[PDB]
């Protein structure tokens, strides 16, 4: 317009407030990594479902006390015992095996001495119990770990490997979860060639599409490649319409400044009839970053029109797009993790809040990590895992110094 | 045997020392996430390949100084200009467009005032240049960012989205990288049923296979599901042989203690002819953890036989298996990230080093995260992202207290 300068805080809140939560679907539990449960999950069985030995040893009657006992048989994992242990008798048990009727404690083998075995040495016949067992010792009673009817996972749970294991444990192999967003990515500019192309006069290769698609894929979300679109409103509208049809989220880069061949804001408003919530953000880099929504038949589509400069595109993707996607896939608090780190070098502050990719590293025993802004040789074998978040300068603070503590958004595996 | 108790430090070093680095393969750069480059990568073009405007404005002759200028044409992104700017003239430029012959600086539009435009207002004819340009201002010279022949990525680089973007930029769309390990996972025990099964007497559901497969998949590695194997040496040998054929790494759980129906160590040694490097580790949980290698025709297979207890299996998988896999896929320093955190609760120390899953959380402005051992309601919506690493007790230290600083291995996204 130019659009009003929007503060970072307002822009970020606006993205989260205006972004929808996707609907739900039933998935197989093996496909649950990173998904958010949209149902509570209950156990239909006890764990353990039988009284289970926690040791290799003997199932005994505690009342018998220590002494010499006839071994009447063995309880092995996976088989329900049929015999009842009577006074003066014991049954061999292994870890995880059921406790036979008549026994009320387990004595571990280390607290015993073998008296007699078969001539072939394959069968134990008589054992000395050296200790006084406590009633119930070394037995997991029925339901000790999980009770039938217990809620073991609550709706809203963001699942990792252990949650998948718990679903397996309780036999709940299909669960309701939020859908993942499908994210379409488009590059714009008459100067852009595909990565596969040799250069031609006046042209460069499109890098943003690759970088943005990889960023989204890193977070586990399905993507759509919408290719390169030229600087003209008809082609841009057609590409946006394809994105809307095929995806939940459309990410563009380029063409959002006020230049003569920058059409995206006009197309979003006048042709697409989308609602542009902000078109400029008071931030460095990322000034022309644009966020729009489009409501079609009770479905809200999300559009991020990011700056064309490659550094600006990847920075703004991490600040605005990734949290939106986290909200869409059902994460209750979709905010990124922000940690405290020490600056590895002095840095000049800008009137705008500043953001820069960095590498976070821990040093021996020092409690806080160091943040080294990207751009020793070894500090190049590693990809950026942080985004430095530097404050606006004040009449007081014009610079931050090496060692001073700053906020860093986590954007990669530490 | 019982095998010697191996210290944690020795066991860990032994895994890393004995684990091979996999060979290399050529991949498409879009498939490069998490891969390690096995070649240096060079630029074959300059970036930018032409002198490029960094602003919307006018390409000028700095020697002309400020004043009123005829606009002879426009240089738009993607088109090589044909006209030469002479004294008294300027050419309109947009960001990323080539600088025409004859011009040596760019003046941004904000430092100008328009004098004359066409009757239709679509074409600018005359402009007032308000500033004295510095030579070369607001131009990226040829090769400013990347030079032809420059090494832009070194062998050993562990790639993320920005590295993929750089490959796209320089047009190197196929790269040599280390292979990813294929990891086969097996559960053992006559008591185990599939997750899909209803319980039967004496039985429980297999959870470890799901948890371990999910853990490995979370790190991006392909997996093989070897199912459930009973407690007998013939079936175990057959399953191990299948794993060896189909995978680079075999993970088993269960059957590694000294129980009567525990055969895995015997099978690995006597039947498989593998070299067991340790069979017990002085650690809690994880005492019976076993690591073996098998060399077949110049190929080294890796076998981890983990404890059957589900908590022990997932803990030892994170401590030993994941670093091995990182080495196999070419990561030069495969050690996990360890951070410092504050204990959320008092904890009793064991003679053994202790490990427990936890959740790491940052609090407002406090520099160090808090580590809350797994097992408010909201602290259940989140999956474990840390492994607490507690020291062995000493005659002095028998307990650690809330707030004290401890080591935590990162095992999930923070
Ligand atoms: N996909 C892309 N890959 C690499 N560079 C790009 C890409 N898109 C745009 N650029 C470059 O970024 C710079 C700014 O582009 P521009 O379209 O003006 O961004 P905006 O107008 O959105 O701020 C130009 O130098 C342009 O060539
Ligand atoms: N895949 C599995 N899923 C769930 N529980 C298991 C699994 N494998 C073993 N267990 C249980 O873990 C416990 C220890 O098993 P065990 O085979 O004795 O381990 P190890 O001998 O290797 O220490 C037993 O209670 C057993 O039923
Ligand atoms: O206008 Mo920017 O600073 O390249 O996003
Ligand atoms: O023997 Mo463990 O402590 O279950 O691995
Ligand atoms: Ca452009
Ligand atoms: Ca077993
Ligand atoms: Mg532009
Ligand atoms: Mg056992
Ligand atoms: Mo135990
Ligand atoms: Mo900017
Ligand atoms: Mo910038
Ligand atoms: Mo800029
Ligand atoms: Mo700028
Ligand atoms: Mo700017
Ligand atoms: Mo800009
Ligand atoms: Mo920029
Ligand atoms: Mo710039
Ligand atoms: Mo243990
Ligand atoms: Mo244990
Ligand atoms: Mo144990
Ligand atoms: Mo134990
Ligand atoms: Mo133990
Ligand atoms: Mo054990
Ligand atoms: Mo255990």
């Amino acid at each position: 317009s130019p659009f009003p300068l929007t503060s970072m805080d307002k822009a970020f809140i606006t993205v989260l407030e205006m972004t929808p939560v996707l609907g739900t679907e039933i998935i197989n539990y093996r496909d649950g990594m990173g998904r958010v449960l949209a149902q509570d999950v209950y156990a239909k069985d006890n764990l353990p479902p039988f009284p289970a030995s926690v040791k290799d040893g003997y199932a005994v009657r505690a009342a018998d006390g220590p002494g010499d006992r006839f071994i009447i048989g063995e309880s092995q994992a996976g088989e329900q015992p049929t015999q009842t242990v009577m006074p003066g008798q014991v049954m061999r048990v292994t870890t995880g095996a059921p406790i036979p009727c008549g026994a009320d404690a387990v004595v571990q083998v280390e607290d015993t001495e073998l008296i007699r075995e078969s001539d072939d040495g394959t069968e134990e016949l008589e054992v000395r119990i050296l200790v006084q067992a406590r009633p119930g010792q070394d037995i997991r009673p029925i339901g000790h770990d999980i009770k039938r009817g217990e809620c073991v996972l609550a709706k809203g749970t963001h699942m990792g490997p252990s949650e998948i294991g718990l679903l397996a444990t309780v036999g709940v192999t299909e669960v309701e979860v939020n859908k993942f967003p499908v994210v379409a990515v488009m590059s714009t500019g008459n100067e852009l060639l595909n990565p596969e192309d040799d250069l031609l006069p006046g042209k460069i290769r499109d890098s943003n599409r690759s970088t943005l698609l990889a960023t989204i894929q890193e977070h586990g979300y399905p993507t759509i490649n919408l290719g390169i679109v030229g600087d003209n409103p008809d082609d841009l509208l057609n590409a946006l319409n394809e994105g809307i049809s095929r995806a939940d989220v459309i990410i563009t880069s380029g063409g959002v400044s006020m230049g003569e061949k920058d059409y995206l804001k006009q197309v979003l408003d006048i042709d697409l009839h989308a609602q542009i919530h902000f078109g400029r953000v008071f931030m460095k880099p990322g000034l022309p970053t644009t966020f729009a929504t489009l409501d079609i038949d009770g479905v809200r589509k999300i559009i991020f029109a990011l700056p064309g400069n490659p550094v600006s595109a990847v920075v703004t993707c991490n600040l605005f797009v990734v949290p939106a996607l986290r909200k869409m896939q059902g994460i209750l608090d979709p905010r990124p993790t922000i940690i405290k780190a020490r600056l590895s070098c002095d840095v000049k502050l800008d009137p705008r809040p500043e953001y820069h990719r960095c590498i976070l590293t821990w040093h021996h025993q020092e409690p806080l990590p160091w943040a080294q802004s990207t751009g020793s040789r070894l500090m190049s074998m590693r990809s950026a895992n942080g985004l430095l978040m530097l404050p606006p300068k004040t009449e007081q603070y014009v610079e931050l110094h090496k060692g001073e503590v700053v906020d860093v958004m986590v954007i990669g595996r530490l």
Side-chain angles (χ1 to χ4, degrees), chain A residues 37 39-42 150-155 157 159 163-164 166-167:
Chain A
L37 286 171
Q39 63 170 99
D40 298 316
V41 179
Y42 291 86
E150 185 183 337
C151 178
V152 296
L153 290 166
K155 64 180 177 292
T157 300
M159 297 189 288
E163 286 72 41
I164 286 168
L166 181 48
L167 292 175

Side-chain angles (χ1 to χ4, degrees), chain A residues 142-218:
Chain A
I142 291 172
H144 180 76
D145 299 304
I146 306 175
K147 288 170 179 54
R148 178 172 36 236
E150 185 183 337
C151 178
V152 296
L153 290 166
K155 64 180 177 292
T157 300
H158 190 194
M159 297 189 288
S162 286
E163 286 72 41
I164 286 168
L166 181 48
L167 292 175
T169 299
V170 300
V172 175
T173 49
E174 278 78 27
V175 290
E176 191 180 351
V177 297
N178 295 96
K179 295 170 173 188
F180 276 179
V182 175
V183 185
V185 180
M186 176 200 317
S187 288
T188 73
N190 290 348
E191 77 275 24
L192 300 179
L193 294 169
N194 289 292
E196 297 78 8
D197 295 332
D198 298 329
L199 294 188
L200 295 164
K203 313 291 195 188
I204 61 170
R205 296 185 189 87
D206 173 10
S207 64
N208 293 349
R209 192 155 38 104
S210 295
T211 306
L212 294 170
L213 285 164
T215 295
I216 300 309
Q217 293 161 4
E218 192 173 32

Side-chain angles (χ1 to χ4, degrees), chain A residues 301-320:
Chain A
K301 304 288 182 175
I302 297 294
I303 303 162
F304 294 94
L306 306 180
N309 173 271
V311 176
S312 307
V314 66
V315 169
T316 58
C317 184
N318 277 284
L319 289 167
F320 297 117

Side-chain angles (χ1 to χ4, degrees), chain A residues 42-324:
Chain A
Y42 291 86
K44 64 197 178 187
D45 312 279
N46 296 305
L47 186 78
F50 47 84
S53 184
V54 314
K55 301 289 180 55
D56 295 329
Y58 307 84
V60 310
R61 291 172 173 256
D64 283 351
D68 295 351
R69 307 291 176 251
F70 298 108
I71 303 168
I72 59 172
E74 180 159 5
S75 176
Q76 284 152 41
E79 181 182 83
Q80 194 65 236
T82 55
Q83 303 164 267
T84 295
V85 178
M86 304 306 305
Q89 313 177 338
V90 303
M91 179 174 307
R92 199 164 181 189
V93 294
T94 58
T95 304
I99 306 306
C101 187
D104 77 331
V106 168
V107 172
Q108 64 194 348
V109 64
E110 293 84 3
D111 287 330
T112 74
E113 295 168 314
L114 190 59
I115 291 164
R116 177 117 65 94
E117 60 175 24
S118 61
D119 294 345
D120 53 47
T122 68
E123 191 167 46
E124 299 185 350
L125 309 175
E126 193 179 343
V127 61
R128 176 164 295 170
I129 303 297
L130 296 169
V131 298
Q132 175 59 71
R134 311 161 240 112
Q137 73 165 52
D138 285 331
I139 295 169
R140 287 155 63 222
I142 291 172
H144 180 76
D145 299 304
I146 306 175
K147 288 170 179 54
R148 178 172 36 236
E150 185 183 337
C151 178
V152 296
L153 290 166
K155 64 180 177 292
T157 300
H158 190 194
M159 297 189 288
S162 286
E163 286 72 41
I164 286 168
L166 181 48
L167 292 175
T169 299
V170 300
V172 175
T173 49
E174 278 78 27
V175 290
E176 191 180 351
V177 297
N178 295 96
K179 295 170 173 188
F180 276 179
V182 175
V183 185
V185 180
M186 176 200 317
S187 288
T188 73
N190 290 348
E191 77 275 24
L192 300 179
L193 294 169
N194 289 292
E196 297 78 8
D197 295 332
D198 298 329
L199 294 188
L200 295 164
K203 313 291 195 188
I204 61 170
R205 296 185 189 87
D206 173 10
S207 64
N208 293 349
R209 192 155 38 104
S210 295
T211 306
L212 294 170
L213 285 164
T215 295
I216 300 309
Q217 293 161 4
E218 192 173 32
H219 288 264
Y221 307 126
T223 59
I224 298 291
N225 191 321
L226 292 178
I228 298 165
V229 184
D231 298 306
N232 75 89
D234 289 332
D235 289 345
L236 288 163
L237 175 63
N238 291 336
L240 290 165
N241 279 335
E242 183 187 337
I244 287 163
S245 177
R246 299 179 69 182
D248 304 301
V249 180
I250 302 80
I251 307 174
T252 68
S253 71
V256 279
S257 292
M258 293 163 57
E260 193 191 333
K261 298 298 187 303
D262 291 355
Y263 299 104
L264 256 182
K265 285 170 170 158
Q266 299 161 239
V267 170
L268 289 171
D269 170 25
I270 300 162
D271 302 323
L272 201 64
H273 313 305
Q275 287 58 245
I276 299 175
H277 299 291
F278 54 85
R280 286 195 302 162
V281 183
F282 197 71
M283 68 182 304
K284 182 176 167 179
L287 190 69
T289 303
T290 300
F291 171 65
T293 58
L294 177 69
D295 297 315
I296 314 142
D297 300 315
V299 170
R300 169 160 291 186
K301 304 288 182 175
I302 297 294
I303 303 162
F304 294 94
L306 306 180
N309 173 271
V311 176
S312 307
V314 66
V315 169
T316 58
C317 184
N318 277 284
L319 289 167
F320 297 117
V321 178
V322 168

